[PDB]
From a paper:
Here we focus on the prokaryotic Argonaute [name] from [name] DSM4304. We show that [name] forms a heterodimeric complex with a protein encoded upstream in the same operon, which is a structural equivalent of the N-L1-L2 domains of long pAgos. This complex, structurally equivalent to a long PAZ-less pAgo, outperforms standalone [name] in guide RNA-mediated target DNA binding.
Next, we obtained cryo-EM structures of the [name] complex with two variants of gRNA/tDNA heteroduplexes: g30/t51 (30 nt gRNA, 51 nt tDNA, final resolution 2.83 Å) and g17/t17 (17 nt gRNA, 17 nt gDNA, resolution 3.56 Å), and a 2.5 Å crystal structure of [name] bound to a 15 nt 5′-phosphorylated ssDNA oligonucleotide. The nucleic acids resolved in the cryo-EM maps include a 25 bp protein-interacting fragment of gRNA/tDNA heteroduplex in the g30/t51 structure, and the full 17 bp gRNA/tDNA heteroduplex in the g17/t17 structure. [name] proteins in these structures overlay with an RMSD value of ∼1.2 Å. We will base our further discussion of the [name] structures on the higher resolution cryo-EM structure with the longer (g30/t51) gRNA/tDNA. The contact surface area between [name] and N-[name] proteins in this complex, as calculated by the PISA server, is 1380 Å2, and includes 15 H-bonds, indicative of stable association. Interestingly, the C terminus of [name]-N in the [name] structure is adjacent to the N-terminus of Ago subunit, implying that both proteins could have evolved from a single polypeptide, and also accounting for the fully functional scfAfAgo fusion protein. The [name]-N subunit sterically masks the [name] surface that was previously implicated in [name] homodimerization, making [name] oligomerization across this surface unlikely. As predicted, [name] superimposes with MID and PIWI domains of RsAgo, whereas [name]-N superimposes with the N-terminal domain and the L1-L2 linker domains. Only the RsAgo PAZ domain has no structural counterpart in the [name] complex. Similarly to RsAgo, [name] binds the gRNA/tDNA heteroduplex in the positively charged cleft, which is formed by both [name] and [name]-N subunits, forming multiple van der Waals and H-bond interactions to the RNA/DNA backbone.
Residue numbers in the entry:
A (entry chain A): 1 to 427
B (entry chain C): 18 to 246
The structure:
DNA sequence: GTTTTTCCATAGGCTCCGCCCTCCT
RNA sequence: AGGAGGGCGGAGCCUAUGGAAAAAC
């Protein structure tokens, strides 16, 4: 028989006016946003975004615009906002490109585009253009028609506020808790070829939040770029907050198993040696290379009154090096728990580490709680993805970039543009 | 406080030592049962030994891997009649045509798939990981088919019916296609029932014969306990 | 005379991509 | 592409262990 431990309770998001709301309850979060607004309300150059579509004289489009304005002004507190309206004759790339050019020429802070239906080459060939120029938010008219307008608009507005440079919420969690730096990994297989992407997440204001993103790297150049990433991320951390020392550096790997020696472990060990040679990291620096996994064959059954599912934050000890981590949970409603499909946990394995046996329990539990915490920092909507940010975001970036490359879109080079590392265009 | 279940099915009895005959590896090695490759040494076990056996206990690190493959081989010879051996290797694959009542069973062959693997932990505890999948086969050519291909070959209504039936056989949704409050418990009940039926067990505990002794499996989910620290 | 790559092999474990649906405050 | 989840189909990746060969030095 195995043992398990649950993340300590009391987890709350942080709101704009310094208050906090209970987690996992979306209605209370929306009420708190109405009362106090987002944690970081964006400052907008033009205070005016655009609504580009082709369904002119449509009541659904008018309701979409009204809901967008109402929620931007009231629940998101982006006051004095203005939504213009642009119409393209046909859904071909040329016409929508002309309309987004007109919207940019008028001067806008973001583009709120409505695509009539599902078309991958158009969508990527045009999203590559948008992310290279301005924050953007696509809609599908068929999906918008068949979905309740309130939930749809609220989720797209979470996405868009985050894309505009805002911070809807941050975890109200201990800042002296968990690792200092995390370098997550994500991959996409195109024609049996892996393209990898790195996310640089580290503590800026005590709170840990996603900071930078990397271009896609080939498997051959994966290790050298991981080395450069470690050096760059520790340099950036020391730049961001002096008076702090680098004590814990965790590295998250997805889509590939890490090599327990002569691989990611070798590169990370050599980088740490070099960094402590320049006295950039602490002498007692503790590192770990982690494997995150969802295609494991394991299923966990929980409390019968919790829909037979484990409570979120449950860490099941498969072995001393591999753990199962429950991240979702049935959400309460005005009437009760909601019917759910069986939920598969997250497999977390420590491929490599530098921890001594005395500190192992504390260090592994710290990294598991921090994975649970950065699970809730996903900003695509009110319900967060099971993946933590450190591996969720690079996976999205790798998918977008590979799709743009295969569909002939405008090249995306994150290294050239600072906003490409520093803004969640991929959400 | 509470109890969690993992779908790992514990093995409460196994031989303490087994007959293992390590021989030099060669390029003409045929990878099959009763023999394993670990580096330059090929280890013979069970009926594959050749009387130069070496007694190795569970304290050895060799025992864990040789016994993983040993369990995979032993359980491959206790398959009941309605189940058929699909593939034997790192995992044991058993398939069974779904003969329960579902519409369009005469054109779409839905079959179960028990993916069986061994989980070892604490250097002495072994177990069986059972994972269930449903294989959708186009019955006329008996070849694997997908929902989109079902809709292409037979229409939208057939595709919807087969989708609902598959998600109900997984017990993730209701037979009418909705979510419900006991899907996870029904999924575990389903896994336990198919494991019991696949290994011919009408009981919780079944024993399997092996040259080094006997293997006893619980055919129940493994409980997980809350530890406070 | 002397470490790196670069291919093999078996044993094991995922792991990406599509599309099919049920749900959301 | 508002997301979240599950399922299915399709390719394969990837680790570990060994092996050799080759070019170094
Ligand atoms: Mg998006």
């Amino acid at each position: 028989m195995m043992e398990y431990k649950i993340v300590e309770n009391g987890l709350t998001y942080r709101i704009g006016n310094g208050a906090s709301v209970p987690i996992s309850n979306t209605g209370e979060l929306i009420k708190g946003l109405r009362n106090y607004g987002p944690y970081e309300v964006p400052s907008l150059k033009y205070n005016q975004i655009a609504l580009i579509h082709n369904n002119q004289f449509s009541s659904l489009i008018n309701q979409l615009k009204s809901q967008i304005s109402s929620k931007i002004d009231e629940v998101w507190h982006i006051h004095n906002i203005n939504i213009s309206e642009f119409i393209y004759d046909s859904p071909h790339f040329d016409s929508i490109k002309s309309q987004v050019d007109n919207a940019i020429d008028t001067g806008v802070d973001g583009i709120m585009l409505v695509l009539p239906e599902y078309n991958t080459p158009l969508y990527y060939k045009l999203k590559s253009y948008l992310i290279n120029s301005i924050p953007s938010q696509f809609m599908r008219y068929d999906i918008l028609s068949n979905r309740n307008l309130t939930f749809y608009v609220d989720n797209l507005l979470v996405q868009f506020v985050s894309k505009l440079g805002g911070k809807p919420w941050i975890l109200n969690v201990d800042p002296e808790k968990g690792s200092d730096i995390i370098i997550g990994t994500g991959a996409t297989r195109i024609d049996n070829v892996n393209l990898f992407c790195f996310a640089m997440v580290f503590k800026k204001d005590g709170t840990m939040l996603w900071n930078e993103i990397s271009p896609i790297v080939t498997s051959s150049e994966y290790l050298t770029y991981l080395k450069s990433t470690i050096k760059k991320v520790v340099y950036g951390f020391k730049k961001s907050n002096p008076d702090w020392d680098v004590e814990k550096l965790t590295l998250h790997v997805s889509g590939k198993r890490p090599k327990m020696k002569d691989g990611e472990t070798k590169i990370l060990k050599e980088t740490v040696e070099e960094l402590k040679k320049q006295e950039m990291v602490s002498r007692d620096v503790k590192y770990a290379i982690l494997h995150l996994n969802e295609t494991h064959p394991f299923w966990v059954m929980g409390d019968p009154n919790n829909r037979f599912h484990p409570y979120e934050g449950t860490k099941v000890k498969l072995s001393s090096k591999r753990y199962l981590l429950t991240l979702l949970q049935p959400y309460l409603k005005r009437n009760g728990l909601e019917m759910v499909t069986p939920i598969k946990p997250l497999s977390v394995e420590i491929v490599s580490d530098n921890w001594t046996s005395e500190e192992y329990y504390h260090n592994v539990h710290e990294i598991l709680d921090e994975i649970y915490y950065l699970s809730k920092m996903n900003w695509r909507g009110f319900r967060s993805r099971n993946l933590p940010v450190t591996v969720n975001y690079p996976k999205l970036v790798a998918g977008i970039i590979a799709n743009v490359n295969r569909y002939g879109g405008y090249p995306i080079n994150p290294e050239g543009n600072r906003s490409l590392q520093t803004n969640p265009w991929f959400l | 406080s509470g109890i969690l279940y993992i779908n790992i099915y514990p093995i409460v009895n196994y031989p303490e030592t087994i007959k293992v005959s390590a021989i030099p590896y060669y390029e003409e090695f045929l990878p099959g049962k009763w023999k394993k490759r670990i580096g330059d040494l090929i280890y013979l076990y069970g009926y594959g030994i050749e009387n130069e056996f070496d007694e190795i206990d569970n304290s050895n690190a060799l025992f864990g891997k040789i016994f993983r493959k040993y369990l995979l081989d032993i359980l491959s010879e206790n398959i009941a009649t309605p189940w058929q051996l699909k593939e034997l290797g790192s995992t044991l694959r058993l398939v069974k045509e779904i003969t329960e009542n579902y519409e369009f069973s005469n054109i779409i062959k839905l079959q179960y798939e028990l993916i069986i693997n061994v989980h070892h932990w604490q250097n002495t505890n072994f177990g069986i990981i059972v994972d269930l999948k449903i294989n959708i086969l186009d019955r006329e050519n008996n070849q694997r088919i997908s929902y989109t291909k079902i809709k292409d070959k037979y229409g939208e209504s057939v595709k919807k019916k087969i989708w609902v039936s598959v998600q109900a056989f997984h017990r993730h949704l209701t037979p009418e296609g909705k979510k419900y409050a006991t899907a996870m418990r029904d999924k575990f009940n389903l896994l336990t029932g198919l494991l019991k039926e696949a290994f011919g067990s009408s009981e919780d505990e079944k024993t399997f014969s092996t040259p080094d002794g006997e293997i006893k499996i619980v055919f129940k989910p493994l409980e997980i306990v809350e530890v406070s620290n």
